[PDB]
Enzyme design. Structure first.
Site, PDB file in Angstrom:
ATOM      1  N   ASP A  13      46.713  44.995  38.981  1.00 53.52           N
ATOM      2  CA  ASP A  13      45.977  43.732  39.169  1.00 53.52           C
ATOM      3  C   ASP A  13      46.713  42.532  38.602  1.00 53.52           C
ATOM      4  O   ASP A  13      46.688  42.307  37.399  1.00 53.52           O
ATOM      5  CB  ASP A  13      44.593  43.854  38.539  1.00 53.52           C
ATOM      6  CG  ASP A  13      43.768  42.593  38.683  1.00 53.52           C
ATOM      7  OD1 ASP A  13      44.165  41.684  39.444  1.00 53.52           O
ATOM      8  OD2 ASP A  13      42.713  42.525  38.034  1.00 53.52           O
ATOM      9  N   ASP A  58      46.310  37.311  43.529  1.00 51.47           N
ATOM     10  CA  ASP A  58      45.405  38.254  42.882  1.00 51.47           C
ATOM     11  C   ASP A  58      45.316  39.583  43.615  1.00 51.47           C
ATOM     12  O   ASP A  58      44.594  39.703  44.623  1.00 51.47           O
ATOM     13  CB  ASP A  58      44.003  37.605  42.766  1.00 51.47           C
ATOM     14  CG  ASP A  58      42.983  38.494  42.047  1.00 51.47           C
ATOM     15  OD1 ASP A  58      43.375  39.427  41.322  1.00 51.47           O
ATOM     16  OD2 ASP A  58      41.766  38.239  42.206  1.00 51.47           O
TER      17      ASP A  58
HETATM   18  C1  LIG Z   1      39.833  40.575  36.961  1.00 54.93           C
HETATM   19  N1  LIG Z   1      39.546  39.640  38.046  1.00 54.93           N
HETATM   20  C2  LIG Z   1      40.402  39.439  39.086  1.00 54.93           C
HETATM   21  N2  LIG Z   1      41.544  40.154  39.195  1.00 54.93           N
HETATM   22  N3  LIG Z   1      40.174  38.578  39.995  1.00 54.93           N
HETATM   23  C3  LIG Z   1      39.228  37.469  39.877  1.00 54.93           C
HETATM   24  C4  LIG Z   1      38.956  36.893  41.252  1.00 54.93           C
HETATM   25  C5  LIG Z   1      39.744  36.340  38.991  1.00 54.93           C
HETATM   26  C6  LIG Z   1      40.975  36.396  38.342  1.00 54.93           C
HETATM   27  C7  LIG Z   1      41.424  35.351  37.525  1.00 54.93           C
HETATM   28  N4  LIG Z   1      42.640  35.520  36.938  1.00 54.93           N
HETATM   29  C8  LIG Z   1      43.261  34.704  36.072  1.00 54.93           C
HETATM   30  O1  LIG Z   1      42.862  33.579  35.777  1.00 54.93           O
HETATM   31  C9  LIG Z   1      44.540  35.214  35.463  1.00 54.93           C
HETATM   32  C10 LIG Z   1      45.018  34.691  34.265  1.00 54.93           C
HETATM   33  C11 LIG Z   1      46.214  35.187  33.741  1.00 54.93           C
HETATM   34  C12 LIG Z   1      46.906  36.209  34.406  1.00 54.93           C
HETATM   35  F1  LIG Z   1      48.068  36.699  33.913  1.00 54.93           F
HETATM   36  C13 LIG Z   1      46.381  36.704  35.595  1.00 54.93           C
HETATM   37  N5  LIG Z   1      45.233  36.200  36.086  1.00 54.93           N
HETATM   38  C14 LIG Z   1      40.641  34.200  37.341  1.00 54.93           C
HETATM   39  C15 LIG Z   1      39.402  34.081  37.966  1.00 54.93           C
HETATM   40  C16 LIG Z   1      38.925  35.107  38.782  1.00 54.93           C
HETATM   41  F2  LIG Z   1      37.722  35.009  39.386  1.00 54.93           F
HETATM   42  C17 LIG Z   1      37.910  37.973  39.300  1.00 54.93           C
HETATM   43  S1  LIG Z   1      38.196  38.855  37.917  1.00 54.93           S
HETATM   44  O2  LIG Z   1      37.106  39.786  37.715  1.00 54.93           O
HETATM   45  O3  LIG Z   1      38.258  37.969  36.795  1.00 54.93           O
END
Ligand SMILES: CN1C(N)=N[C@](C)(c2cc(NC(=O)c3ccc(F)cn3)ccc2F)CS1(=O)=O
Length: 379
Positions: free
Chosen positions: A222, A38
């Protein structure tokens, strides 16, 4: 080592719409977990309790190298939260550099809408900077720890290939993962991976918006977001133009808002009715920019888990935002992306694995002459 890191190639796995994870170990003796990569957060946080969606979880009691920090951390997001207990332990990446570092770990002990039912990951690896770490910037991020404690160069790169795969090259660049040249955009500020978009073209047609809008109030890279997210005013104009470019077929309003899916008979998606999208990014040199171009292959996401349809159903993965532009998996799957921390810059090159048809291909092109690129940034 430089330019080639065969050990790290294909070290990423994932499921469509669930993100990309790397295998990691924590503690002594080593406990193996799958960890979401992430670039949009800065905490290393892992499941530490038997939540029913988790394949496994960090068992601190089994680790001789665990150290308690006697502090908690509560982390809410827009649609989800986790809460954990801070500590340090020994961490390594089996398909990464041959090192073991003592890093901060948030042991997650309560969460909501965080773990995904049916996913194969048990934690998140925040690769962004200390400024956005929780609870505050004193909690040193994993990558910072890795760089301090070893001779791993201060750079990582991501090839995300849309079950999915890819490569996270830690401490370098692997030239086999891209074609043509890398082009670099400055990291505006070290918090998120912040960049500046100076021009947007749909099918070559400029949106003619005050560029300050493209970055209202932020533009970031991101890997932890699926969509290309755009400020509403920019999203409004973008869809408007995408609507016009794609007028030979007609789709419902909700589709463009991601309120419903659209489906076609298998193998008959009209890719060509859909326009390319080009973002020009601030270049390395005064008045110089470059452009990255993506396809509908990127912003039209296959939805697999749809039991009420037998066709090829897709989500429109461009959406509006209050927090600025987010260049998520929709952008990154087009490109090999180099997070050149040492140089405060992000490189883009055409990805050797990106999904494309025989008529159009994702592109990274320059140089272009763009004036007043400083005025594109929001203060
Ligand atoms: C936007 N965000 C991010 N970049 N990081 C966090 C940690 C996150 C990311 C995910 N990301 C994902 O689950 C995800 C899903 C499909 C993709 F192509 C990329 N990432 C899940 C939980 C979470 F807390 C919080 S968020 O505000 O939601």
């Amino acid at each position: 080592r430089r330019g080639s890191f065969v050990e790290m190639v294909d070290n990423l796995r994932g499921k469509s719409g669930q993100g990309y994870y790397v295998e990691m170990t924590v503690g002594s003796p080593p406990q193996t977990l799958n960890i979401l990569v992430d670039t949009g957060s800065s905490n290393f946080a892992v499941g530490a309790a038997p939540h029913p969606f988790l394949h496994r979880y960090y068992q601190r009691q089994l680790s001789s190298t665990y150290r308690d920090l006697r502090k908690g951390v509560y982390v809410p997001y827009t649609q989800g939260k986790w809460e954990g207990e801070l500590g340090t332990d020994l961490v390594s990446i089996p398909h990464g550099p041959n090192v073991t570092v003592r890093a901060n770990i948030a042991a997650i002990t309560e969460s909501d809408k965080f773990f995904i039912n049916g996913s194969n990951w048990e934690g998140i690896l925040g690769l962004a900077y200390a400024e956005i770490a929780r609870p505050d910037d004193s909690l040193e991020p994993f990558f910072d720890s890795l760089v301090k404690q070893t001779h791993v160069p201060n750079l990582f790169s991501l090839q995300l290939c849309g079950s999915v795969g890819g490569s996270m090259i830690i401490g370098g660049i692997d030239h086999s993962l891209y074609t043509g040249s890398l082009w670099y955009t400055p990291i505006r500020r070290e918090w998120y991976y912040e960049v500046i978009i100076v021009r947007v073209e749909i099918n070559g047609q400029d949106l003619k918006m005050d560029c300050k809008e493209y970055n209202y109030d932020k533009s970031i890279v991101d890997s932890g977001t699926t969509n290309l997210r755009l400020p509403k005013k920019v999203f409004e104009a973008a869809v408007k133009s995408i609507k016009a470019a794609s007028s030979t077929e007609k789709f419902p309003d909700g589709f463009w808002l991601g309120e419903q899916l659209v489906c076609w008979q298998a193998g008959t998606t009209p890719w060509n009715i859909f326009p390319v999208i080009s973002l020009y990014l601030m270049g390395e040199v005064t008045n110089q920019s470059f452009r990255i171009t993506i396809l509908p292959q990127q912003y039209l996401r296959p939805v697999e888990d749809v039991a009420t349809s037998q066709d090829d159903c897709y989500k429109f993965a461009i959406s509006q935002s209050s927090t600025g532009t987010v260049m998520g998996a929709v952008i990154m799957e087009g490109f090999y992306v180099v997070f050149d921390r040492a140089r405060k810059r992000i490189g883009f090159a055409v990805s050797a694995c990106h999904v494309h048809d025989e008529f159009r291909t994702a592109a990274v092109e320059g140089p272009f002459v763009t004036l007043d690129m400083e005025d594109c940034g929001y203060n």
